[PDB]
Design a protein around this ligand. Structure first.
Ligand code: FAD
Ligand code: FAD
Ligand code: FXK
Ligand code: FXK
Ligand code: K
Ligand code: K
Ligand code: K
Ligand code: K
Lengths: 587, 587
């Protein structure tokens, strides 16, 4: 399918040069395009095994089999003499800008995936527009360019986690000889939020600058795809217009869910509001048991808050439940309270938020446990963290023919194509994929290369590592133990595990058998590592490197033959020997 | 060579049972041995591909081809009826203890390797003695069981590093909203040392307990091997005696070097003294440029010391020199001074150490630079960190025939055997091997299994990862860039690199382009990762996991197809794209 790849590549690339590495006439064209600041893809036919067949197949477009050959939006433009003559006639600029559509690419959504896709496409000469609009929360919260992670997700959340971890650092410093008295040190919410928000603002501004500098058109407008190639945009003045694009990337992400109960929208908040909140939440109820819920509860408690988590059923559904239980046990032993088997029925307002002060209001939460008994307690802040959902019917006229699943997410092939041939979807709205910022970035960058640089590489969505930034962090890569046993049977699963104590916790008088790690392995496949799990400090740094080895098919023997780095937490993965089957305690 | 393996296994195992998994008569013997608390190796012939050939070859020792078959020190003891009859006659205990020698194994040296080897051997029924003696430093410093890492190496050093890192944690906490004022907080050396030493003491005691509980004989005595099977021991009362052992493991480690200059031994100290020093060093000169020198200088400076490092030529000789320079640049920008191209000539004493106080003395250091100009400056403490050396002529009568190299280290085959067939060497004294605690532990455990459990697996000494715990930590696995270019040529090496900023450093107002990572790759071998290098926080946790992937032969494509964990430092390894060849700035 060499000819098939060539046709697809020529038809979708915006500006593409077919070249050879050792070709003085190709260098002449490259240098001209560089001086003219015309961005383009380049295919060096000498570095392709099928380069000779591609060179001959080009004649079916251009009539010639020589290099260089320049194409614009599927049209052969010329050889070296022709391109250079156009340039000398000041005609090349017009030719490279000729298009049926306003843009080669319209990205709807300026978050993790969309920005990554748009920037990468422009690198290859695609005339690109990135649309971003932030629908305000119920209380009016909005923010700048960059998406969920940047503004109300990974970035602020990990920063506030770090604020929380520094609590323990202050306690520990005494034991290591520093003269501070932790009991006399307090935390100021407003100071922290100001610092977090100043960094977010530098990211908002940096994205706008980068797009300008990369010749990407940024529109702060809500986009609606009204036909395969037409995007209706509404700007902040409510002015409505239509732009057209050849390729469309949907990258609109999700927003928090609210339960359908009285008072939820009016009196509660979500993570969208928390990270810029202009008052300390105070006594807080977090409703939900997702990683978002536990991460937020964890740092609120470490910053001195009185924190309760209301749990409908289990913690961290979809994660290894042994690990989820250890995560919650640690939180409960460090000052987080849990209302178990419990759901809210209504939020009543007892005091309105005092805008002229850094004070929360006061709320009455009524709920009930699964056995029917009543929950009733006052809180100053109620945070809903019960999941996130796409928002697409506000972005997709059903007329267009982009298929959604029962959850409202876009149904895509393994190259991110929707059911409309020129429309693609990336990030959290792509059904069935891990909903993680680096996934969206990789999917968007790799898709842009396929569209505009003739690349073929797909995103690999398997064994994507995670880290939950709870007070004691939880990193994982691969299968949970229970999923492994379900798939292969208990007799084919061997689990090696161990507690451990960070050296840093020894002089600090922290707990000896709370950190924990395990390898879930498949006996019949040479003890293949199906899943790695670690509860401990710096769990994301620990886990990341092993995700490469698991991607490569690491076995238990691969871990064993590797030598540890001492003293680290991570080295314990290289000497695991206690199996769950053996019954020997992991302590 | 199945018969050859069997002969070797039978001759060297102390107590070994040849069995099958599904064998009720073997279970009868196993249960008896368990009740009698007779430890032994077990070879399940059904789990060996050549099990049928081994079962037949056993008859050449025992006259029978059935299982179970029990051997003690090369002697066939009996089948199930015979072993059970011995047990019922209360004769089995005597038979299993019969030996030509006092011990199956004498370990000379109770450090990382030796303790690991001795404990593992005893698991298989080897009657084991572990000898440990700590020759005092020039000023009289000594310590307990456990070796260099435990007492005067990795453990105390990383603990004091952590004390130093907490300095930055206190600074950072303010920016994250905590009310402390770092400028009013000071550090107390004695409090820290007391905490470090209390942990070390728990390790000393724990090793003694473990050896007792594992039936290993601990002798706090200096051992000298006077013939292949005889060890002369001198206890702390100077009483001299001789014990005999079948196998001997030399695991005696190294001690710091002193330069041959007036005043060095009398007035300087080394790392052996630093970690229990009963006074703060004060204004300190560290002579040397090893990882030990830089690690100690780094935490002394972070704990408020006035610190100078005297460097003969380069930093971290043998490490990637681009990385070593970045390590030193960071130290110099954070309050460590460097006396470059400089060597000491003599240390003169100006004030004697005041034992009735926590005060150092005062010293005059005279030296000279390579151009002949004079160095002369006063310091309160001078720490020599100019390398470590073995001490074996005090442990090895040349009579015995154990070959040493020009540096005094033991010349070993790839199974740790010396030139004397029953004598092995592990850890730092084994010539040519990485001198690291986890290496010594793995070598010792794996050797014990080969000696006493019929194992065949060797220690793999290639691509052993390291981490230097300087104030900004430096982790590496594999080749330095310069070694890669020397081995394969510059045109075959591609280096991908990037600066990065820990998210934790953003709100804290730390430096934007100081952390750095690179992958040194081989073009002609599918961009194989020859070396990984990272300068940043938690560098050991970052690096460890990748050492498995490198062990498995990771390529650049393996890193690229892996998805990052966000937000971490380590994830930057999964998106590297800037090559050194390209000339594009890594910032
Ligand atoms: C509290 C929280 C914490 C998280 N922590 C982590 C973590 O630690 N590690 C990790 O990997 N992931 C984390 N995530 C998930 C991560 O943020 C998402 O996976 C990532 O942001 C998804 O990127 P995206 O491009 O799909 O969508 P988004 O980043 O959400 O961007 C979509 C953009 O498009 C906008 N938009 C929507 N509709 C339109 C429209 N019609 N027109 C124009 N613009 C529109 C949206 O307002 C938004 O700005 C967290 C999420 C949350 C809520
Ligand atoms: C300051 C310093 C910091 C270090 N930091 C790290 C780090 O961060 N990570 C890492 O991996 N490695 C580190 N190391 C190296 C590590 O400590 C050594 O590689 C490890 O301890 C070697 O183990 P070993 O068994 O060979 O010898 P040792 O641990 O030194 O034990 C040998 C024992 O045998 C004793 N002995 C000597 N002669 C006799 C005799 N005749 N009879 C009886 N006993 C005898 C010795 O006194 C000693 O107790 C560090 C070393 C130093 C000095
Ligand atoms: O106590 C904390 C905790 C551990 N496991 C849990 C499961 C559901 C709700 C709370 C917990
Ligand atoms: O300034 C610190 C430093 C960076 N590189 C070095 C090499 C030799 C001696 C000191 C340094
Ligand atoms: K990515
Ligand atoms: K190992
Ligand atoms: K080891
Ligand atoms: K990647």
């Amino acid at each position: 399918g060499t000819s098939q790849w060539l046709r697809k590549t020529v038809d979708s690339a915006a500006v593409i040069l077919f070249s050879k590495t050792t070709c003085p006439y190709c260098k002449k064209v490259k240098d001209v395009l560089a001086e003219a600041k015309i961005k383009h893809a380049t295919i060096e036919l000498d570095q392709l095994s099928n380069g000779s067949a591609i060179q001959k197949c080009l004649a079916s477009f251009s009539k010639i089999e020589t290099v260089p050959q320049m194409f614009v939006r599927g049209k052969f433009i010329g050889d070296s003499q022709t391109v250079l003559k156009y340039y000398s006639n000041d005609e090349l600029a017009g030719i490279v800008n000729e298009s049926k559509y306003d843009y080669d690419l319209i990205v709807i959504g300026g978050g993790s995936g969309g920005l990554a896709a748009g920037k990468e496409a422009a690198k290859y000469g695609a005339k690109t527009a990135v649309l971003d609009y932030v629908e305000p929360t119920p209380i009016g919260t909005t923010w700048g360019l960059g998406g969920t992670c940047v503004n109300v997700g990974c970035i602020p959340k990990k920063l506030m986690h770090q604020a929380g971890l520094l609590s323990h650092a202050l306690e520990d410093a005494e034991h290591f000889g520093w003269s501070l008295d932790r009991s006399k040190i307090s935390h100021n919410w407003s100071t922290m939020v100001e610092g977090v928000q100043s960094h977010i603002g530098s990211l908002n501004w940096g994205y706008k600058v980068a797009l300008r500098d990369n010749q990407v058109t940024y529109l702060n407008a809500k986009g609606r795809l009204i036909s395969p190639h037409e995007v209706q945009i509404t700007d902040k003045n409510q002015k409505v217009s239509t732009i057209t694009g050849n390729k469309i990337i949907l990258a609109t992400g999700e927003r928090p869910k609210y339960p359908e109960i009285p008072g939820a929208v009016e009196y509660g908040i979500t993570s969208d509001d928390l990270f810029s909140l202009p008052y300390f939440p105070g006594k807080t109820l977090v409703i939900g048991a997702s990683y978002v819920a536990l991460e937020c509860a964890g740092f609120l408690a470490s910053l001195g808050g009185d924190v309760t988590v209301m749990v409908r059923s289990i913690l961290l559904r979809g994660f290894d439940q042994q690990m989820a239980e250890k995560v919650g046990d640690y939180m409960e032993n460090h000052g987080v309270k849990f209302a178990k088997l419990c759901v809210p029925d209504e939020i009543k307002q007892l005091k309105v938020v005092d805008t002229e002060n850094n004070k929360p209001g006061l709320l009455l939460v009524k709920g009930h446990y699964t056995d029917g008994k009543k929950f009733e307690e006052e809180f100053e802040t109620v945070i809903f963290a019960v999941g996130r959902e796409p928002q697409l019917s506000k972005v997709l006229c059903e007329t267009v023919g982009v298929k959604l699943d029962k959850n409202g997410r876009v149904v895509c092939t393994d190259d991110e194509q929707t059911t409309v041939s020129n429309v693609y979807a990336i990030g959290d709205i792509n059904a069935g994929k891990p909903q993680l910022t680096p996934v969206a970035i990789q999917a968007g960058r790799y898709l842009a290369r396929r569209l505009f640089a003739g690349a073929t590489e797909l995103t690999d969505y398997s064994n994507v590592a995670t880290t939950v930034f709870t007070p004691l962090e939880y990193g994982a890569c691969g299968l949970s133990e229970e999923d492994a046993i379900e798939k292969y049977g208990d007799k084919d699963i061997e689990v090696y595990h161990s507690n451990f104590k960070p050296l840093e916790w020894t002089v600090a008088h922290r707990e000896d058998n709370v950190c924990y790690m395990k390898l879930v392995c498949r006996k019949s496949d040479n003890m293949r590592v199906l899943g790695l799990h670690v509860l401990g400090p710096n769990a994301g740094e620990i886990t990341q490197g092993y995700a490469v080895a698991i991607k490569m098919g690491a076995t238990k023997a691969d871990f064993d033959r590797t030598i540890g780095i001492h003293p680290t937490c991570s080295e314990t993965f290289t000497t695991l020997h206690v199996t769950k089957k053996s019954g020997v305690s992991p302590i």
